[PDB]
Amino acid sequence: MKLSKDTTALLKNFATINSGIMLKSGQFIMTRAVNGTTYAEANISDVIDFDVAIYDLNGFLGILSLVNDDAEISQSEDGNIKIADARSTIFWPAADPSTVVAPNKPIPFPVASAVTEIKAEDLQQLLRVSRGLQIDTIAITVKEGKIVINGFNKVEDSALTRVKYSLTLGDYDGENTFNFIINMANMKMQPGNYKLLLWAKGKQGAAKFEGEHANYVVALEADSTHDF
Amino acid sequence: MKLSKDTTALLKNFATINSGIMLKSGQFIMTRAVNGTTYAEANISDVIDFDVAIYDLNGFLGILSLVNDDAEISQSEDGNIKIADARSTIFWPAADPSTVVAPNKPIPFPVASAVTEIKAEDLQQLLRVSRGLQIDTIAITVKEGKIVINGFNKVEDSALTRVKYSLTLGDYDGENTFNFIINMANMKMQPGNYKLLLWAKGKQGAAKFEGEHANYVVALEADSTHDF
Amino acid sequence: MKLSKDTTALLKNFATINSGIMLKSGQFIMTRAVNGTTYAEANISDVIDFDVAIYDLNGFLGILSLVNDDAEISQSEDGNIKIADARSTIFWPAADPSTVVAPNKPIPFPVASAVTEIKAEDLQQLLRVSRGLQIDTIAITVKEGKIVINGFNKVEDSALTRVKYSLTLGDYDGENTFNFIINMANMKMQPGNYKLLLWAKGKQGAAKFEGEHANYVVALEADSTHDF
Amino acid sequence: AKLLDRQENGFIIEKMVEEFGMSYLEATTAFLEENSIPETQFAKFIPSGIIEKIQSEAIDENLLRPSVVRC
Amino acid sequence: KSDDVNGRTKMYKNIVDGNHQMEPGMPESFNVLLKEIRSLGINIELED
Amino acid sequence: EFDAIKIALASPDMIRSWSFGEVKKPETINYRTFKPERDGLFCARIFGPVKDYECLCGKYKRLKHRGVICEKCGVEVTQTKVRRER
Amino acid sequence: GPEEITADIPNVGEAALSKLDESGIVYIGAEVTGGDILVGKVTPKGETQLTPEEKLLRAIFGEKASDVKDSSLRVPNGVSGTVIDVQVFTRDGVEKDKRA
Ligand SMILES: [Zn+2]
């Protein structure tokens, strides 16, 4: 079963959240942070056919980039993984599904208590200029009636009152206020326009980022405030 | 001011002389090395529209390099810098002017005794070779009627007598002999052609590199000598 | 003398087995690891004009890669290499050869038992997969009469039961089989197509990979089996 | 003062054996202690070469077991 | 041949290199007794 | 070499004049490091180096660093031969 | 750490090693003399006993080199002769080897 180049790109994006997975049959892959807080899901053009655990999925994708694309990939006789060229026959050791944790399911994300979307250059801009200003956390909150993305230095300011960078996707008509706080390390997502869903219930809360290749549901931090 | 990529590259290159900078009023930049031995200056095309002392300029350049080009670089409300494109913003706290070391004024270098030129390919070759044989010093003199740079390593070639490499800076028809010595650590001149103006008197000595864009100045090492 | 880019390339990949070398007047160069297990050799269509050893081939060829190739490689007056650049005259110290293991003769490869061939993609592909699988051992055997390779990581596998890689190298017109064992730490040839001779008797053997520029003689590992 | 040339130190360290004549191991350990050199910050002082002959003469002198011979 | 450590080393060398000649030195265990009586307050000394 | 041996007594003054220090701690060894104690009946702090030319500072290797005392160890730096007799 | 009765010994000529068995117990009938080895028994190193002359090699080869050292049972110098029998004693429930 072939792993397409777009398949390899999404496998790259998922191997970031985890250097391994338990591949499960379907046209879909998904993985969880080791903490399970920020999660990745993606219905992929390739259809998984044999459920197989892999430990170094990043290195597995390296191995993939070491062999030609249309090599037939199967689960080998001893249970391991066979990459088959016209000549090359390679057995990558198939992992144990308990050495690598998998997410329970694709997160049935709740309804968004607020909606916006972040442009490609928007997310690129925030996440990359965070290096110049040393931004370590983000505050998405109602500001001037807008869903603003304030890059806060939670090391230098745990209160998130000293902005060095903000991002304003668009104004959000609302009286019910909030100041969602989410780790800059929760931003496992690749660049690109990501529809931002801000679900807010009590203290449970999430930002669902719906990109061009995967949905990542991010559990809001305990400091994310929301008020309806 | 919206510094171009050429201007910001020039800023990154001047940073090789000082992280601390006092970007002054005008289209001009003015810097000196922390040991008071190297000096840099360059007329830019944009106008610095507010005096500012910066301690870490290259990160300022990175901040410049990622945002939308329509980013507005002005003076923030707090007496510091702001770089905000059409949708986001970046705050930059300006270092105190009483905490940056720099020339009071431009160093014009109004006098020279030995004029020579040095071009781009020999520039890069000297920069690489002095890294390559651990050459730590250049000596400008006349050997067989040529203004020649002789490279040496001082700890093992103490009197700078091992010419493992002789680079000719140009012809010499002149009676004024000299040892214009520059220790490699002051070598910060970027890619670009440089007219080297050498002046010296008694023990004091300075070599100037007038480039396609800028001037560098080096105090010639203490053993530099001149016979007129 | 002067050494073509292919000539400096043969030296660059000769530095892969042994750092420096002992060169003599002539048009042939050879090198061997001090273990005696590997020996690369290639004639050069460039000519050597004296007898010398080079302690650092890497820095040597690097300081040479900055001069336009017309630079003459003569002996210096002070007992080292004088490379008269088109514009400079660089000097790099001449290694007294006794301090580098110089082979006294070029290795002749006696009558090989088995014959086959490797290619550019095959060889380079194996070079790369030996990393992603950390494969230390390569075991050349016959399957159904076919000369092929089986890859093992001997550390995790004493008697090498875990074939980690398998490739079709070619046919073997016979039944006289073998497991010629080699460490991946000896496959230092540049990528390319090669003929493959195998001398093997009793306990000893020699793998001869013949390239479009050179020949590599590698000692097989004693654990190998063979019959002819 | 500063002696950061590795291959020059190779020229100097062959002087140890070729001159004194005990072994490359003891000669270079003598060098290491003479100039007071630790064993983890050596790659900045020692030529890349002498290391290989050190390994060679070591395994030939059997400093370690058959566990190290095969590899 | 018994105690002169410096002495016996010098000997061993000179004999294994063809020179029969002796360096007297001064015993060691004697010094042991010397310090051993220095233990008790009986100050002992070795005049010029 | 030297002439007649003399005997005499010793004012406790001269006892002080001998000793390279004074011992108070009644014990000797750490039983894990098997090293001398800090101020005990075998401690280097008075008697000296258990190896030669270097102590638990690890600070002084060659003849360049010999002699001068440590501050971590506190002990002088020399050969262990002199420990036999101090 | 505890010690082993392997046939695995550093800085010794393999010529000698051959005479042992796979366990490390020389065979019955080997005419032996002093200055040789009858059993191989090896110990972890320890720290205060590490000379620079091996600090070198442990630096290079990776500290998986100088972790052990010999304690082998020799043949008491001044004796010769022939082996007649070898007794091997072990804790029960602990593994029992070939000779046992
Ligand atoms: Zn200490």
Side-chain angles (χ1 to χ4, degrees), chain F residues 14-70:
Chain F
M14 199 203 309
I15 311 187
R16 306 168 163 78
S17 82
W18 287 334
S19 64
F20 292 99
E22 173 203 5
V23 48
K24 273 75 49 183
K25 305 187 63 185
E27 197 41 42
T28 76
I29 291 317
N30 212 24
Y31 177 45
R32 309 180 64 80
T33 79
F34 291 9
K35 293 194 295 182
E37 210 185 11
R38 287 181 194 177
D39 187 13
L41 266 293
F42 293 78
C43 172
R45 198 256 164 278
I46 303 99
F47 293 141
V50 63
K51 322 169 172 185
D52 65 77
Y53 289 74
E54 203 158 337
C55 185
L56 55 96
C57 51
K59 206 173 191 166
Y60 299 146
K61 300 162 184 289
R62 208 65 178 176
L63 272 72
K64 304 162 302 196
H65 322 110
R66 67 185 278 172
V68 52
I69 83 162
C70 175

Side-chain angles (χ1 to χ4, degrees), chain A residues 119 121-122 124-125 128-133 163-169, chain B residues 56 59-60 62-63 66-68 83 85-93:
Chain A
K119 278 74 189 188
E121 181 62 29
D122 271 327
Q124 204 165 246
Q125 163 182 241
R128 282 205 173 192
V129 309
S130 315
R131 191 175 95 102
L133 293 180
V163 179
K164 265 151 66 192
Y165 165 99
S166 157
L167 182 45
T168 49
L169 303 173
Chain B
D56 205 357
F60 195 55
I63 285 302
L66 281 161
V67 194
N68 182 311
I83 301 161
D85 66 342
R87 293 182 183 174
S88 54
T89 173
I90 275 176
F91 299 89
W92 190 280

Side-chain angles (χ1 to χ4, degrees), chain D residues 59 62-69, chain G residues 8-11 42 64-68:
Chain D
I59 182 53
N62 204 344
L63 268 302
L64 322 172
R65 287 96 59 208
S67 89
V68 314
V69 182
Chain G
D8 187 71
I9 294 92
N11 61 11
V42 183
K64 53 97 168 183
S66 47
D67 67 330
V68 300

Side-chain angles (χ1 to χ4, degrees), chain A residues 78 80 87-91, chain C residues 121 162 164-168:
Chain A
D78 55 5
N80 276 311
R87 279 154 301 176
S88 77
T89 299
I90 306 95
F91 303 107
Chain C
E121 61 163 336
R162 282 292 181 186
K164 320 206 68 189
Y165 182 100
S166 320
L167 179 78
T168 291

Side-chain angles (χ1 to χ4, degrees), chain A residues 177-195:
Chain A
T177 60
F178 51 80
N179 275 262
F180 294 131
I181 301 176
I182 272 175
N183 191 342
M184 256 302 293
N186 285 3
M187 332 314 294
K188 282 285 189 44
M189 75 280 295
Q190 74 216 24
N193 187 78
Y194 272 78
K195 184 202 193 194

Side-chain angles (χ1 to χ4, degrees), chain A residues 6 66 125 130 136 139 150 174 199 219:
Chain A
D6 292 331
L66 312 183
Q125 163 182 241
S130 315
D136 52 9
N150 321 312
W199 154 64

